[PDB]
Amino acid sequence: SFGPQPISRLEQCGINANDVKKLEEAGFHTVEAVAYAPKKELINIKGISEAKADKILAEAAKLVPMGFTTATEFHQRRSEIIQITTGSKELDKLLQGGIETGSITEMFGEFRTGKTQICHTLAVTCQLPIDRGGGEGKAMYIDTEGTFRPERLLAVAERYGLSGSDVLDNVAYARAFNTDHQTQLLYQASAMMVESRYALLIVDSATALYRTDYSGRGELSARQMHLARFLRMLLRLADEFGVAVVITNQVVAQVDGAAMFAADPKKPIGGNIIAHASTTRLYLRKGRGETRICKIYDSPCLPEAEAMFAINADGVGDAKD
Amino acid sequence: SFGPQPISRLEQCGINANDVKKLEEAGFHTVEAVAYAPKKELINIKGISEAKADKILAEAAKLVPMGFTTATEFHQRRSEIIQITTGSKELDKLLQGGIETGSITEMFGEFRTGKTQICHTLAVTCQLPIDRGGGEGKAMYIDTEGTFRPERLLAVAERYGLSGSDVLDNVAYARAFNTDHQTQLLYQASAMMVESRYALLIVDSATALYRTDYSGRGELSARQMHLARFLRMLLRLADEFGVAVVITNQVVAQVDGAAMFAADPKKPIGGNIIAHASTTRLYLRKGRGETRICKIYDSPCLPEAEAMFAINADGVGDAKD
Amino acid sequence: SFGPQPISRLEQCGINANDVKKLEEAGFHTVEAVAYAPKKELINIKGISEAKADKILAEAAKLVPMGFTTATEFHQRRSEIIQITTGSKELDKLLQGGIETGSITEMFGEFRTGKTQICHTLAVTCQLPIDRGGGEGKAMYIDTEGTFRPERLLAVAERYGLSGSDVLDNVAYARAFNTDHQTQLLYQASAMMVESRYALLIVDSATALYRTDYSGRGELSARQMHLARFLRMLLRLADEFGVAVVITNQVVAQVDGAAMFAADPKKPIGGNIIAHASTTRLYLRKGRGETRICKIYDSPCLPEAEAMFAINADGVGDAKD
Amino acid sequence: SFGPQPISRLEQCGINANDVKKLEEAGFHTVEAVAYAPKKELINIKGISEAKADKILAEAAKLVPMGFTTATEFHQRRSEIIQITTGSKELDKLLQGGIETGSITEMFGEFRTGKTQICHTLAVTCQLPIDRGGGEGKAMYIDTEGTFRPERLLAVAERYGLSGSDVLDNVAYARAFNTDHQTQLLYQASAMMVESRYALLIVDSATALYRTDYSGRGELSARQMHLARFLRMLLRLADEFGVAVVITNQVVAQVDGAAMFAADPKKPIGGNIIAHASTTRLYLRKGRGETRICKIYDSPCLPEAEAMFAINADGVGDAKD
Amino acid sequence: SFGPQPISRLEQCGINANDVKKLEEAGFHTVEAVAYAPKKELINIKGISEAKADKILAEAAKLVPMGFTTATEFHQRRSEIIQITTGSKELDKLLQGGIETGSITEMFGEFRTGKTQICHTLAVTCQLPIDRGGGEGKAMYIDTEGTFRPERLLAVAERYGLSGSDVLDNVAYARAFNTDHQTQLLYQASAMMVESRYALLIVDSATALYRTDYSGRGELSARQMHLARFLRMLLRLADEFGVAVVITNQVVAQVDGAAMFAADPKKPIGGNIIAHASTTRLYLRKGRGETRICKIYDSPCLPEAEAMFAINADGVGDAKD
Amino acid sequence: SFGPQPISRLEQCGINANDVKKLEEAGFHTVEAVAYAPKKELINIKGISEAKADKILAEAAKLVPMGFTTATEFHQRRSEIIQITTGSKELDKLLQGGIETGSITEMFGEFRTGKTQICHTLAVTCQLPIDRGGGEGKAMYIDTEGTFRPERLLAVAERYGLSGSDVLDNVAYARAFNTDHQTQLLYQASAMMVESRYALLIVDSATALYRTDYSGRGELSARQMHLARFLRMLLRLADEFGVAVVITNQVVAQVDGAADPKKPIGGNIIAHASTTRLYLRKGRGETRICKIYDSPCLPEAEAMFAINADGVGDAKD
Amino acid sequence: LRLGLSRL
Amino acid sequence: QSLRLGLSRLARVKPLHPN
Amino acid sequence: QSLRLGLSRLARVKPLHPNA
Amino acid sequence: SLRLGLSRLARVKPLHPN
Amino acid sequence: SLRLGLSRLARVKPLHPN
Amino acid sequence: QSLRLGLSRLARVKPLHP
DNA sequence: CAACAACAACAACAACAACA
Ligand SMILES: [K+]
Ligand SMILES: [K+]
Ligand SMILES: [K+]
Ligand SMILES: [K+]
Ligand SMILES: [K+]
**DSSP state string for D148-206:** --HHHHHHHHHHTT--HHHHHHTEEEEE-SSHHHHHHHHHHHHHHHHHS-EEEEEEETT
d(CA A251, CA A274): 13
Q: Is D279 annotated as a binding residue?
A: no
d(CA F279, CA A267): 61
Contact partners, residue B319, CB within 8 Å, separation at least 6? B291, B308, B309, B310
Q: After which residues is chain K broken (C to N over 2.5 A)?
A: none
**CB of D255 lies under 7 Å from some atom of strand M:** yes
Are the beta carbons of E142 and E174 closer than 8 angstroms?
yes
Parallel, antiparallel, or unpaired for β C83-84 and A266-268?
Answer: unpaired
Chain K residues with CB under 8 Å of B82 CB are: 5-8
Contact partners, residue A165, CB within 8 Å, separation at least 6? D72
From E111, E168, E192, residue closest to F68, measured CB to CB: E192
Are the beta carbons of A71 and A285 closer than 8 angstroms?
no
Identify which of H6, A147, H12, E68 has the alpha carbon closest to the alpha carbon of residue D243: H6
**Element housing F236 (H / E):** helix F220-241
d(CA E127, CA E200): 9
d(CA A154, CA A163): 8
d(CA E133, CA D307): 44
Q: Which nucleotides of M are covered by protein (CB under 7 A)?
A: 1-20
* D205 prior amide bond cis, ω within 30: yes
d(CA D64, CA D57): 11
**Angle at which helices B50-63 and B17-26 cross, to 10°:** 80
Cα-to-centroid distance, D178 and ligand 4 (Å): 19
Q: With CB atoms and an 8 Å threshold, state whether K4 touches B135.
A: no
Among chain F residues, CA nearest to E114? F296
Q: Determine the residue type at F83.
A: Q
Q: What technique solved it?
A: cryo-EM
Are the beta carbons of B298 and C136 closer than 8 angstroms?
no
Cα-to-centroid distance, B213 and ligand 1 (Å): 19
| DSSP symbol at E128 | S
Identify which of F103, F78, F105 has the alpha carbon closest to the alpha carbon of residue F94: F105
- Tell me the longest C-alpha to C-alpha distance in chain C: 68
Q: Determine the residue type at E19.
A: D
CB-based contact, D152 to chain E, within 8 Å: yes
Are the beta carbons of E160 and E123 closer than 8 angstroms?
no
**How far is the CA of F208 from the CAs of D186, F253, F278, in angstroms?**
63, 16, 18
Taking domain E3-75, whether its CATH number is 2.60.40.1120 is answered by no
Are the beta carbons of E156 and E164 closer than 8 angstroms?
no
Protein residue nearest nucleotide M2, by CA to C1'? C271
Q: Give residue numbers, 159 to 218 of E, with CB < 7 Å from strand M.
A: 211, 215, 217
d(CA A150, CA A116): 12
User: F76-317 belongs to which homologous superfamily?
Assistant: P-loop containing nucleotide triphosphate hydrolases (3.40.50.300)
Calculate the dihedral angle through the C-alpha atoms of D46, D49, D50, D53, rounding to the nearest 10 degrees. Answer: -70
Contact partners, residue C233, CB within 8 Å, separation at least 6? C183, C186
d(CA E301, CA E75): 14
Q: Return the sign of the alpha-carbon dihedral for residues D164, D169, D170, D175.
A: positive
d(CA A280, CA E191): 63
SS3 A8: helix
Q: Give residue numbers, 211 to 240 of B, with CB < 7 Å from strand M.
A: 211, 217, 220-221, 224-225, 228
d(CA A252, CA C207): 47
| DSSP symbol at D143 | E
d(CA B77, CA B59): 25
Contact partners, residue F3, CB within 8 Å, separation at least 6? F197, F241, F242
**DSSP state string for B25-78:** HHT--BHHHHHHS-HHHHHHSTT--HHHHHHHHHHHHHHS--S-EEHHHHHHHH
Cα-to-centroid distance, E204 and ligand 2 (Å): 71
Q: With CB atoms and an 8 Å threshold, state whether J16 touches E82.
A: no
d(CA A261, CA A268): 17
State the burial class of residue B124 (Cβ atoms within 10 Å of its Cβ: 0-12, 13-18, 19+).
buried
Parallel, antiparallel, or unpaired for β C251-253 and C266-268?
Answer: antiparallel
Contact partners, residue F296, CB within 8 Å, separation at least 6? E116, E147, E149, F275
**CB of A276 lies under 7 Å from some atom of strand M:** no
Chain B residues with CB under 8 Å of K9 CB are: 80
CB-based contact, D78 to chain A, within 8 Å: yes
Cβ-defined contacts of A45-53 (< 8 Å, 24+): A46/A22, A47/A19, A47/A22, A48/A19, A48/A22, A48/A23, A52/A19
What CATH number belongs to B76-321?
3.40.50.300
Q: How many CB pairs under 8 A join D and E?
A: 95
Among chain D residues, CA nearest to A251? D272
Are the beta carbons of E139 and E197 closer than 8 angstroms?
no
d(CA D86, CA D93): 10
CB-based contact, I19 to chain A, within 8 Å: no
Cα-to-centroid distance, D248 and ligand 4 (Å): 13
Contact partners, residue B22, CB within 8 Å, separation at least 6? B45, B46, B47, B48
**CB of C224 lies under 7 Å from some atom of strand M:** yes
Identify which of E97, E75, E70 has the alpha carbon closest to the alpha carbon of residue E85: E97
Among chain D residues, CA nearest to A117? D300
Are the beta carbons of C241 and C198 closer than 8 angstroms?
yes
**CB crowding F171-184: b at 16 or more within 10 Å, else e:** bbebebeebeebee
Separation of F220 CA and M20 C1' (Å)? 22
> CA angle at residue B214 from B212 to B219, to 5 degrees?
155
Identify which of A171, A148, A110, A156 has the alpha carbon closest to the alpha carbon of residue D300: A148
Name the nucleotide nearest F211; use CA and C1'. Answer: M18
Cα-to-centroid distance, E283 and ligand 4 (Å): 13
Q: How many CB atoms lie within 10 A of CB E260?
A: 7
Are the beta carbons of C99 and G3 closer than 8 angstroms?
no
Q: With CB atoms and an 8 Å threshold, state whether E255 touches F220.
A: yes
Q: How many CB atoms lie within 10 A of CB E164?
A: 16
Identify which of B28, B25, B38, B26 has the alpha carbon closest to the alpha carbon of residue B6: B28
Torsion region of A7: left, alpha or beta (phi above 0 gives left; psi -120 to 50 gives alpha): alpha
**CB of A218 lies under 7 Å from some atom of strand M:** no
Q: Give residue numbers, 223 to 252 of D, with CB < 7 Å from strand M.
A: 224-225, 228, 252
**Angle at which helices B179-195 and B220-241 cross, to 10°:** 10
From C178, C179, C208, residue closest to B36, measured CB to CB: C178
Residues with CB under 5 A from ligand 4 (ion): E 298
Chains H and D lie in contact, requiring 3 or more CB pairs less than 8 Å apart? yes
Identify which of D274, D309, D269 has the alpha carbon closest to the alpha carbon of residue D289: D309
d(CA A56, CA A19): 10
Q: What are phi and psi of D69, to 5 degrees?
A: -140, 160
Cβ-defined contacts of C122-125 (< 8 Å, 24+): C122/C84, C122/C86, C122/C200, C122/C202, C122/C246, C123/C153, C123/C171, C123/C200, C123/C202, C124/C152, C124/C153, C124/C156, C124/C157, C124/C160, C124/C162, C124/C167, C124/C171, C124/C315, C125/C84, C125/C85, C125/C86, C125/C87, C125/C156, C125/C160
Identify which of E280, E251, E245, E281 has the alpha carbon closest to the alpha carbon of residue E265: E251
Separation of C250 CA and M3 C1' (Å)? 13
Q: Give residue numbers, 241 to 260 of E, with CB < 7 Å from strand M.
A: 252-257
| DSSP symbol at D218 | T
**CB of D305 lies under 7 Å from some atom of strand M:** no
Q: With CB atoms and an 8 Å threshold, state whether K16 touches B82.
A: no
Identify which of B116, B122, B131 has the alpha carbon closest to the alpha carbon of residue B199: B122
**Domain chopping of chain E, boundaries:** 3-75, 76-321
Q: Give residue numbers, 233 to 272 of F, with CB < 7 Å from strand M.
A: 252-256, 261, 265-269
CB-based contact, J15 to chain E, within 8 Å: yes
From E141, E211, E251, residue closest to F228, measured CB to CB: E211
Cα-to-centroid distance, F276 and ligand 5 (Å): 6
**DSSP state string for E269-291:** SSHHHHHHH-SEEEEEEE-STTE
